[PDB]
Amino acid sequence: FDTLVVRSLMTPSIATLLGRWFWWPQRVRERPVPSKWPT
Amino acid sequence: ATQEEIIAGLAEIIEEVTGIEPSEVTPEKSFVDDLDIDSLSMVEIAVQTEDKYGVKIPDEDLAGLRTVGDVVAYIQKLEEEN
Amino acid sequence: ATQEEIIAGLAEIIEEVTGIEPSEVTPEKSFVDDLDIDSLSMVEIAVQTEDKYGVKIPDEDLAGLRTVGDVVAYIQKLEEEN
Secondary structure, eight states, X not given: OIIIIIIIIIHHXXXXXXXXXXXXXXXXXXXXXXXXXXX | OOHHHHHHHHHHHHHHHTOXXXXXXXXXXXXXXXXXXXXXXXXXXXXXXXXXXOOOOOHHHHHHOOBHHHHHHHHHHHHHOO | OXXXXXXXXXXXXXXXXXXXXXXXXXXXXXXXXXXXXXXXXXXXHHHHHHHHHOOOOOHHHHHHOOBHHHHHHHHHHHHHOO
């Protein structure tokens, strides 16, 4: 149950919702610096 | 950016999502038919672009988009609408 | 003063509060976006600047300022407004 549901669905879902506050108190970014398109 | 630059970034993303070679991807190719990319897979391409290039495409728009040329033009439309 | 002199002073402070290399410090960089500097850290830069050069940046301007060039312009503006 944990491997197929909790680890696969429950845990990843929570990380996306909390965003940068998931890694609190470590200050992180939702996305990196907006990168330009490569040639 | 330029249409050529748009293709290069998107083609790389498709390889991560599906495994299709970046050189294989052409504007003629269609995600649903040629690339055999379902609705779920096409979301991942939009998601990776959302984090990398900042272009987010919802479910409704992704369903409308059919081919690579359509998606490239759709993104280039946003670049045109600067 | 000169544009480089304003940046050089600001670059040293950034290396102290945040430990960000001076090479990263360019006029087009944004504190919140490019430099990943929160509001409180930006205030500390103003506090050190005030006690070093006399340039006092109120909190109202700090929220308004977005990039390094914007900050330099205000400092140059305060240089103009001296």
